[PDB]
Design a protein around this ligand. Structure first.
Ligand SMILES: *[C@@H]1O[C@H](CO)[C@@H](O[C@@H]2O[C@H](CO)[C@@H](O[C@@H]3O[C@H](CO[C@H]4O[C@H](CO)[C@@H](O)[C@H](O[C@H]5O[C@H](CO)[C@@H](O)[C@H](O)[C@@H]5O)[C@@H]4O)[C@@H](O)[C@H](O)[C@@H]3O)[C@H](O)[C@H]2NC(C)=O)[C@H](O)[C@H]1NC(C)=O
Ligand SMILES: Cc1cc2nc3c(=O)[nH]c(=O)nc-3n(C[C@H](O)[C@H](O)[C@H](O)COP(=O)(O)OP(=O)(O)OC[C@H]3O[C@@H](n4cnc5c(N)ncnc54)[C@H](O)[C@@H]3O)c2cc1C
Ligand SMILES: NC(=O)C1=CN([C@@H]2O[C@H](COP(=O)(O)OP(=O)(O)OC[C@H]3O[C@@H](n4cnc5c(N)ncnc54)[C@H](OP(=O)(O)O)[C@@H]3O)[C@@H](O)[C@H]2O)C=CC1
Ligand code: HEB
Ligand code: HEB
Ligand SMILES: CCCCCCCCCCCC(=O)OC[C@H](COP(=O)(O)OCC[N+](C)(C)C)OC(=O)CCCCCCCCCCC
Ligand SMILES: *[C@@H]1O[C@H](CO)[C@@H](O)[C@H](O)[C@H]1NC(C)=O
Ligand SMILES: *[C@@H]1O[C@H](CO)[C@@H](O)[C@H](O)[C@H]1NC(C)=O
Ligand SMILES: *[C@@H]1O[C@H](CO)[C@@H](O)[C@H](O)[C@H]1NC(C)=O
Ligand SMILES: *[C@@H]1O[C@H](CO)[C@@H](O)[C@H](O)[C@H]1NC(C)=O
Ligand SMILES: [Ca+2]
Lengths: 228, 1091
């Protein structure tokens, strides 16, 4: 039975990775440890580590200090600003600007607002909307390929296993057109820069898509040359 | 952690005062000295039936010569430094929008904007931004909002946000981003940031030559550019001076150390050198920081400073160098220089070096009502025109913002009130006072109607009038007594106690001498005044005599060259069916290469009580889904944004976009064969007819295409009306897709069609439909079953383009998946159930050709094949055509070896099948097993009465043969077979099956009766106790089946409840049930059947 367990666990991993990647905010990940101003009404500079995470539906600015007790305080922030078709980014930024978040968090939150010189809103709101529907299509295809892993002829299941990885790669391609404009947009925090590059949830999807394409090609070759 | 030992000043203006943060920020709302004076009281402005026509008030008073000197000798550098300060403070000019206009009606015969006496010509004008939380009731009327930090914090040099001060910075030391010339900012990042309007004198409107400044519109003249450049170069100079005494400072400890010094010098100048000259009285003093004074910019301040400064802007400005040479006629005019891209004179640093020294030595115009032509008749128009009246737009804006009258706003400021017109300006009434009467005749001699601007311009004799002066003064005192970062405040720790006594001693000459690198004796100590001893005497007052002429008006015409292209694109959109029809003709030709009418209507309504119900319910559902969105987009008008531009082109689209998203989605419940095969045997076939699925399928496909043609002919009109609307309306209809800079030129039609996801996917869908519908018609399905079956699989492409199509936020949210989830699920399930089982391949044994169309096929019985009497199968011949399956009712008993199928000729596939097997039996078929419950319910009654009629008598041959076999062999009693018909035309094989049945029935278990039911319109159709014609002993009565007397007398011939199973048309299937019920109140299941 050692083969059937693997044949089930592989499909389970594919489905779980589609579901997890479609909701994980680690597509583009940047990080830096700089000296920045803390907040208003205080000339005191703190030493923190600022990093953002773009996840097809919003960002996560995380400003935490090198120590977690800097100025009779404790600095561990993790705020989210969502631009997906449900919520609004402008209202979230305008409601966070009243609460008095630390200055670099508001800085990095401003960059993605609508009608900003950099313009990182109308190219991210479309990527996180197309590369996120081409991960639901690549899940419907996975369900159908699992249903065709039974009494129905298995060559159609193999074709749908091709389609799963094909749609995964077609989704991963749409989050590649959002690197030509995030690189020009400067993110100079104090005296340090904050570079963003494709994160884990962009490589794991590539690996899963390649695995699905290879499995499909092998199934096609097998059922075309040796019906075993 | 570094050398920045203070609080870095925010760019957006927030968090400036402790208690309330919002006060001076990027989007605060303007307070009011006097409550709103709107028409109703909420948001409607006064108009022309109440107050005079703007263009008619801007010709009677504010028009005159352009050769009058100022009274205080105010040089023309102060006139253009005020335009910079008041761009630092307030900006209420950007049109905010749920797109709403109030236009300027030009009178008849205006020598400029209406020279051909051409009746009425309109001059557009759009309302400015407003606060979304205000404008709902007379308790909080509409309040505008300024788009620049309301503090004097150099928000015109460094931009008014943090994502704006980063694009115009270089991070090379502390230096704003220069260009190829170290004294000119970068024209490269000029596109996303700045305001780019077309030069009205030439027409060019590109981002090449538009510098990058802090004010969004600092290029409105080469004379505001010439001060933006001064402050830019001064910042660079002081920062590269800092970088040479503290070399170990980064690229931030230099920017934030030059920024505060530039800001402090700017504040010192704009407060203690410009203001004591604009209004000729020094500000009182600096008391300590007052954390409670409300520093909010009011509209009355806008009108009192920014729109009053225009009374002394001259016609042309000089240009001199450091030794009084006024050539470089030699004075560039103003009406041609608006939004100048690349001026031939001002191309190098030594040209602005000269423009500034020429502005600092020219005496501006006089401060009175008279405004020059270069703004009154030649101000760059915002839309639809080239030129536009300035003052006739300042009046429309003073009416838009809800400014008070001139007496209300004068008695609400503590000033003494005026009684009549003759005492508005007691000095103007002593010499040429005809202007006071000429403006009185405009208001019907009603003094308490004067707008804020005309009154103030009429009152200002040599200085700003007693009204504007107090507004400007108290506003500029609340702007420093409520500013925390005011350089003189010794509590924010910005400056030391001495570094203030060196910023309070920095005039504007000590900046021109520093930047322009000139000697200190080439200018005067007070740049804002020329007082008869200062160097470079002005040659002569610059009238408009000896200057170039002003470029004339030209109306901008959207949709100008792209009319033939639009027509041709629509024509090609129309000839999708024609190209597909010609291609289909080619494919076919090359595949060849190898009082009784009331009774008729009663019979109609009797047979079709089940088709009308379904058709009416489906069409009612579709009509409801249409009217919902139609009534919505007609009488809701969410934000009234798009409902005002396109009224019909959006209803005709949003209704037929919800109707077709339902039709194209529920057209799949028809071709789910394995569900109908089950349902048609339940109690449902008495309500909805399942044997008309395919007819219903063709009927739902023929309606969706009409609705789609409407849905496309609506969006053609939408795309046309979206190709002539200004950018300042498309930036409000479709935010995120458009952005409102001054270009005002929207995308062409082909951008809408072939460069947008909905448009391109819609063109592809039109092509796919024009292929599928034409190739799947009757004339291209009878001619070839392979063209049909090949093209018709495009519905997958169709259903991918339909999910890609609405996936965009133009008008609403996508809604197709809601309609498409369940039907696609059911269809794919019943397609998997079809693909699961196997299709055996049988060989025809003997298929002889019977007359009248029926074809008695015979073929062997596979080993794993067992069926009950009455179950149908599905066959597909591959000798011609495709894998098209067709159902057929078995007409053979289960006990005999090979099973048969009598196939009646009923169309293309069946005529082909008859043509193939003509004159045999060679080819093969694809059997698909039995299909049905196969009820044997007549084996539990003592007697049964089968009543089959019309087409539904096909499944009775096998039933009769099986009954007689089980009767004779197995050793139920007296089962009757009353079969009624109309003609007995195609069911002649049954007339011989009945003979072969009666011959094999020795126990007399089957009795048969026939009824013909025709009236004299017949062919006439038609010994040993039989009939010589057919040879069967069963009287075939030519009347009409008597049911009630039959079952009535049946109870007498034998005392036995007996089944009344019946199949056929509803007109008989219900009549037999009625006849059964008419006797049940006595000593009769009447159980329907459907095989
Ligand atoms: C992306 O961001 C979202 C939103 O944050 C994440 O979703 C939230 O996840 C947390 C995880 O526990 C859930 O639980 C909440 O956690 C809150 C953490 O509190 C921090 O932030 C507060 C305000 O943002 C802040 O006040 C607080 O202390 C700070 O302020 C004090 C007073 O000013 C000061 O004295 C302190 O020194 C300190 O500076 C923390 O910094 C917690 O406050 C809540 O009570 C709650 O338990 C949230 O519920 C989640 N959000 C929602 C809407 O449910 C998401 O996980 C992020 N993405 C990823 C991948 O992690
Ligand atoms: C002896 C005999 C027994 C039959 N028994 C049955 C039966 O038990 N159950 C049954 O449903 N049909 C039955 N049929 C109908 C049979 O499908 C038609 O005779 C045949 O489909 C004609 O095909 P065509 O190429 O002429 O189609 P067309 O002339 O295009 O079709 C004419 C009519 O046939 C119907 N039709 C077409 N294709 C199908 C299909 N795949 N399934 C159902 N209806 C279709 C259409 O709705 C239309 O009203 C029987 C026909 C014959 C001749
Ligand atoms: N198979 C079933 O057969 C059905 C229809 O086939 P169909 O086209 O009817 O074949 P036909 O229409 O050719 O046959 C109609 C038959 O029904 C008889 N009939 C209809 N209503 C009545 C009534 N109220 N009383 C007595 N006789 C009646 C007709 O008699 P007449 O016309 O002589 O009155 C004729 O015998 C299919 O819908 C399917 O269910
Ligand atoms: C939407 C989509 C669609 C459309 C539009 C259409 C349109 C149409 N159509 Fe259809 N169909 C269809 C979808 C469709 N369709 C389907 C899905 C089917 C089935 C297929 C299978 O089953 O495979 C059909 C099928 C079909 C058929 C056959 C069936 C059998 O045989 O079984 C026919 C005849 C038809 C016709 C038609 C016509 C005539 C038209 C036009 C008018 N179609
Ligand atoms: C199929 C058929 C069809 C066709 C052919 C078309 C064609 C078309 N189209 Fe259409 N549409 C449609 C179907 C259609 N369509 C639909 C169904 C819709 C809806 C979607 C949803 O609802 O989601 C639309 C929608 C739509 C829209 C909206 C979008 C959104 O909302 O998102 C638009 C704009 C359009 C356009 C168009 C055009 C331009 C065309 C061409 C001309 N469209
Ligand atoms: C989930 C699977 C569902 C399958 C489909 C079930 C429902 C099918 C119903 C449609 C069938 C069909 O339109 O057929 C088309 C039919 C032809 O019918 P036929 O087959 O020749 O009749 C067989 C006849 N016998 C049974 C006697 C043999 O012409 C008609 O209708 C004529 C009636 C027109 C009704 C007009 C209604 C007006 C509404 C006005 C609204 C404002
Ligand atoms: C941040 O500040 C600490 C404080 O001492 C300093 O040691 C460190 O060098 C600074 N880092 C940078 C990158 O300026
Ligand atoms: C100023 O302009 C005059 C006029 O052409 C020219 O001769 C002189 O060289 C210029 N520069 C000076 C005086 O520095
Ligand atoms: C300081 O005093 C006055 C104030 O403007 C000024 O005229 C004088 O030149 C200044 N002294 C300098 C700059 O040495
Ligand atoms: C204004 O400038 C002119 C130019 O010559 C001069 O004659 C006049 O005296 C100046 N005004 C005053 C008040 O000095
Ligand atoms: Ca400002």
């Amino acid at each position: 039975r050692l083969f059937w367990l693997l044949r089930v666990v592989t499909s389970l991993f594919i489905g779980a990775v589609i579901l997890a990647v479609n909701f994980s905010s680690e597509w583009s990940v940047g990080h830096v440890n700089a000296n920045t101003t803390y907040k208003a009404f205080s000339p005191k500079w703190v030493s923190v580590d600022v990093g953002l995470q773009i996840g097809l539906g919003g960002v996560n600015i995380t400003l935490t200090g090198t120590p977690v007790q800097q100025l009779n305080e404790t600095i561990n922030y993790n705020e989210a600003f969502a631009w997906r078709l449900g919520r609004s980014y402008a209202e979230e930024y305008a409601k966070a600007l009243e609460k008095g978040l630390p200055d670099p968090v508001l800085y990095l939150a401003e960059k993605f607002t609508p009608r900003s010189p950099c313009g990182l809103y109308n190219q991210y709101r479309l990527a996180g909307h197309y590369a996120s529907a081409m991960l639901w299509v690549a899940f419907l295809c996975w369900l159908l390929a699992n249903v065709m892993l039974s009494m129905p002829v298995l060559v159609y299941g193999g074709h749908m296993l091709l389609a799963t990885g094909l749609f995964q790669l077609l989704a991963l391609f749409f989050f590649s057109m959002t690197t030509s404009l995030i690189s020009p947009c400067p993110l100079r925090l104090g005296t340090a820069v904050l570079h963003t590059h494709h994160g884990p949830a962009f490589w794991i999807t590539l690996a899963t898509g390649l695995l699905c394409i290879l499995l499909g090609l092998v199934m096609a070759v097998a059922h075309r040359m040796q019906p075993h | 952690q570094n050398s920045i030992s203070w609080e870095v000043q925010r760019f957006d203006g927030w968090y400036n005062n402790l208690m309330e943060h919002r006060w001076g920020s990027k989007g605060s709302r303007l307070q009011r000295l006097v409550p709103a004076s709107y028409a109703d009281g909420v948001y409607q402005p006064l108009k022309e039936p109440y107050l005079p026509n703007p263009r008619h008030l801007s010709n009677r008073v504010m028009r005159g010569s352009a050769g009058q000197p100022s009274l205080r000798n105010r040089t023309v550098l102060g006139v253009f430094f005020g335009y910079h300060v008041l761009s630092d403070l307030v900006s209420v000019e950007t049109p905010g929008c749920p797109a709403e206009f109030l236009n300027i009606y030009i009178p008849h015969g205006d020598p400029v904007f209406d020279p051909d006496k051409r009746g009425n010509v309109v001059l557009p004008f759009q309302r400015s931004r407003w606060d979304r939380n205000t404008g709902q009731s007379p308790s909080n009327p509409r309040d505008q909002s300024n788009q620049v930090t309301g503090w004097l914090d150099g928000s015109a040099i460094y931009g008014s946000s943090h994502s704006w001060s980063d694009t115009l910075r270089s991070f090379s030391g502390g230096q704003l981003a220069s260009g190829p010339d170290p004294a000119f900012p970068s024209d490269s990042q000029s596109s996303l940031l700045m305001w780019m309007a077309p030069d009205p004198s030439t027409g060019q409107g590109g981002p090449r030559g538009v510098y990058a400044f802090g004010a969004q519109r600092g290029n409105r003249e080469p004379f505001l550019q010439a001060l933006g450049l001064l402050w830019f170069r001064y910042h660079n100079l002081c920062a590269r001076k800092l970088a040479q005494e503290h070399p170990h400072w980064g690229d931030e400890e230099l920017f934030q150390h030059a920024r505060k010094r530039v800001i402090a010098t700017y504040q010192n100048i704009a407060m203690y050198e410009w203001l004591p000259s604009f209004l000729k009285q020094t500000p009182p003093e600096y008391p300590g920081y007052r954390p409670f004074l409300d520093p909010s910019i009011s509209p009355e301040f806008v009108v009192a400073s920014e729109q009053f400064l225009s009374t002394m802007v001259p016609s042309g400005v000089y240009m001199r160098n450091a030794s009084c040479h006024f050539q470089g006629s030699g004075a560039l005019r103003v009406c041609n220089s608006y939004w100048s891209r690349e001026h031939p004179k001002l191309q190098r640093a030594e040209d602005v070096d000269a423009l500034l020294l020429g502005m600092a030595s020219q005496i501006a115009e006089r401060e009175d009502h008279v405004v020059v032509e270069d703004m009154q008749d030649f101000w760059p128009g915002p839309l639809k025109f080239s030129r536009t009246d300035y003052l006739a737009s300042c009046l429309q804006r003073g009416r838009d913002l809800g400014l008070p009258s001139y007496t209300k706003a004068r008695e609400a400021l503590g000033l003494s009130p005026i009684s009549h017109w003759q005492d508005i300006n007691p000095a103007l009434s002593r010499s040429n006072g005809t202007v006071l009467e000429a403006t009185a005749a405009l208001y019907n001699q009603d003094l308490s109607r004067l707008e804020l601007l005309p009154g103030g311009l009429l009152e200002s004799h040599g200085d700003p009038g007693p009204l504007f002066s107090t507004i400007v003064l108290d506003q500029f005192v609340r702007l420093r007594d409520g500013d925390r970062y005011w350089f003189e405040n010794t509590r924010n720790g910005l400056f030391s106690k001495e570094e203030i006594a060196e910023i309070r001693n920095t005039s504007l000459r000590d900046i021109l001498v520093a930047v322009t690198n000139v000697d200190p004796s080439a200018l005067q100590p007070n740049v804002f005044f020329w007082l008869a001893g200062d160097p470079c005497p002005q040659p002569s007052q610059l009238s408009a005599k000896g200057l170039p002429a002003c470029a004339p008006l030209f109306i901008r015409d959207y949709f100008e060259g792209s009319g033939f292209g639009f027509g041709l694109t629509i024509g090609t959109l129309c000839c999708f069916p024609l190209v597909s029809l010609l291609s289909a003709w080619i494919v076919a030709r090359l595949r060849k290469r190898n009082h009784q009418t009331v009774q008729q209507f009663k019979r109609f309504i009797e047979n079709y009580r089940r088709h009308i119900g379904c058709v009416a319910v489906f069409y009612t559902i579709t009509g409801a889904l249409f009217l919902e969105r139609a009534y919505y987009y007609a009488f809701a008008a969410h934000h009234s944004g798009i409902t005002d531009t396109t009224r019909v082109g959006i209803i005709l689209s949003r209704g037929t976009a919800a109707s077709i998203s339902f039709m194209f989605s529920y057209i799949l419940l028809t071709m789910c064969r394995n569900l109908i095969t089950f349902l048609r045997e339940t109690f449902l076939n008495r309500y909805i007819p399942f044997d008309a699925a395919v007819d219903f399928h063709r009927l739902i496909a023929s309606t969706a295409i009409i609705l789609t043609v409407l849905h496309s002919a609506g969006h053609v009109v939408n795309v046309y009306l979206f190709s002539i609307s200004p950018l300042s309306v498309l930036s409000c209809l479709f935010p995120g897709l458009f952005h409102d800079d001054g270009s005002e030129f929207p995308q062409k039609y082909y951008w809408w069609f072939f460069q947008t996801v909905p448009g391109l996917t819609g063109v592809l869908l039109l092509l796919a439909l024009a292929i599928m519908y034409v190739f799947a018609s009757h004339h291209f399905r009878r001619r070839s079953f392979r063209g049909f079956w090949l093209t018709h699989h495009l519905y997958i492409f169709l259903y991918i383009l339909l999910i890609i199509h609405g996936s965009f936020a133009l008008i609403q949210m996508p809604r197709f998946h809601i309609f498409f989830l369940v039907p696609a699920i059911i269809y794919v399930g019943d397609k998997l159930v079809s693909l699961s089982r196997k299709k055996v391949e049988i060989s025809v044994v003997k298929a002889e050709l019977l007359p009248s169309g029926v074809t008695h096929l015979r073929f062997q019985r596979p080993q794993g094949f067992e069926y009950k009497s009455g179950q149908w199968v599905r066959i597909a011949c591959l000798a011609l055509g495709t894998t098209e399956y067709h159902p057929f009712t078995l007409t053979s008993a289960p006990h005999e070896d090979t099973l048969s199928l009598h196939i009646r000729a009923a169309g293309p596939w069946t005529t082909r099948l008859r043509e193939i097997y003509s004159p045999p039996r060679y080819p093969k078929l694809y059997l698909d097993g039995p299909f049905g419950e196969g009820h044997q319910e007549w084996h539990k009654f003592e007697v049964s009465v089968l009543v089959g009629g019309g087409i539904g008598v096909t499944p009775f041959a096998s039933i009769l043969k099986d009954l007689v076999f089980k009767s004779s062999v197995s050793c139920c009693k007296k089962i009757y077979f009353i079969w009624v018909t109309r003609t007995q035309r195609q069911f002649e094989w049954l007339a011989d099956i009945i003979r072969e049945v009666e011959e094999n029935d020795r126990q007399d278990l089957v009795s048969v009766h026939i009824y013909i039911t025709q009236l004299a319109e017949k062919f006439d159709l038609r010994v040993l106790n039989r009939s010589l014609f057919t040879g069967l002993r069963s009287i075939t009565h030519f009347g009409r089946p008597p049911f009630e007397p039959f079952f009535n007398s049946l109870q007498e011939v034998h005392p036995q409840k007996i089944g009344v199973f019946s199949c056929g048309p509803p007109g008989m299937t219900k009549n037999v049930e009625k006849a059964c019920q008419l006797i049940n109140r006595q000593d009769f299941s009447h159980h329907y059947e459907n095989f």
